[PDB]
């Protein structure tokens, strides 16, 4: 709960940074920048968007290393402290 | 066993939702929608399919965050409670 | 050691199955089929190769679910029982 | 701390090897080779770059198996021994 709120905020800030960076330097629409940031940090990485500038490539290297750990921490916990109980609630007779 | 059955069903429902969504909004054939949903939530993300609409991009953001944890829970357990014993069975003299 | 040998063999068999399947049904050269099988099961998923047939898509769904757990088990252990000691050996004075 | 320094160096060496290999054999600019090496070993795998030669494909198979474990060890620890405390520091009243 308490830890869920922090990983939420931390994830949001990371995604906001990506949205701002890729819309500015890589010229993406904000929605596309957000979508790309999420697809990147979850490692889905479709490649429909990818950085074309050297600035964008270098940022992306750093963004991945800093952001993957945070994002998957949030995912794992969104799963552990928020969805694991809810599914159990729709279990017990 | 019991926990395997629940993660199976949960995964199936998630994949059904993706199949329905991407066949409707993104215009994929159902088999392609299913295939895309699986490739997305396992993070393989080939990019042969990817959402082209803003609706599809937003759903995909949410779908990834909600679904990755469930899918990899199932994978890890399909591995832990179903394939780890079976391989050991074809071991002991 | 003992467990390393089993995860090695298991991984090899999985990769052989993929190599055979994708070279036959998807028409890839064997080296390309092997490379694609590895890129798939490690979730790198560049998308330079991807299944074009419905048979290939369905197999790929199943291949991912069955194979990711095994492959990452091997990777994690190749890391835990084979490279973690070796790096420590080149540490202690 | 001590363990953070080792996983840092190990990661750097792995990324240097990839940078050298893909710039030489696959003809990438060094910055692109580095970027590609990172995108590969974190499994983001956009596919804007991918090996076109058989030498490059075989190396990439081996590079992934050897490098993913190391890279994600570093990521998880960059998260555990360097960012987990820092976020807690900006917490306690
Ligand atoms: C499918 C190619 C996308 C290119 C992104 C810049
Ligand atoms: C390889 C490009 C695929 C585009 C998907 C809409
Ligand atoms: C980059 C497109 C590859 C298509 C694979 C069939
Ligand atoms: C989007 C296609 C990239 C091809 C890399 C060699
Ligand atoms: Cs990917
Ligand atoms: Cs991709
Ligand atoms: Cs793509
Ligand atoms: Cs693609
Ligand atoms: Cs591609
Ligand atoms: Cs691509
Ligand atoms: Na991935």
Automatic annotation (TrEMBL), chains A, B, C, D:
Keywords: Ion channel, Ion transport, Membrane, Transmembrane, Transmembrane helix, Transport
Recorded superkingdom: Bacteria
Intracellular or extracellular location(s): Membrane
Occurrences of domain Potassium channel (ranges): 10-80
Location, primary (coarse class): membrane
Transmembrane segments: 6-25, 55-75
Membrane topology classification: Multi-pass membrane protein
Any one Gene Ontology cellular component term annotated for this protein: membrane
GO molecular function terms listed in the Swiss-Prot or TrEMBL record: identical protein binding; metal ion binding; potassium channel activity
Protein name according to UniProt: Potassium channel protein
Covered range of the whole protein: 21 to 110 of 114
């Amino acid at each position: 709960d308490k830890e869920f709120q922090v990983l939420f905020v931390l994830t949001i800030l990371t995604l906001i940074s990506g949205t701002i960076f890729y819309s500015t330097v890589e010229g993406l629409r904000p929605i596309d920048a957000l979508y790309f940031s999420v697809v990147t940090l979850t490692t889905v990485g479709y490649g429909d968007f990818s950085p074309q500038t050297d600035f964008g490539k270098i940022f992306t290297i750093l963004y991945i290393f800093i952001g993957i750990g945070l994002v998957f921490g949030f995912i794992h916990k969104l799963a552990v402290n928020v969805q694991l109980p809810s599914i159990l609630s729709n279990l017990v007779p």
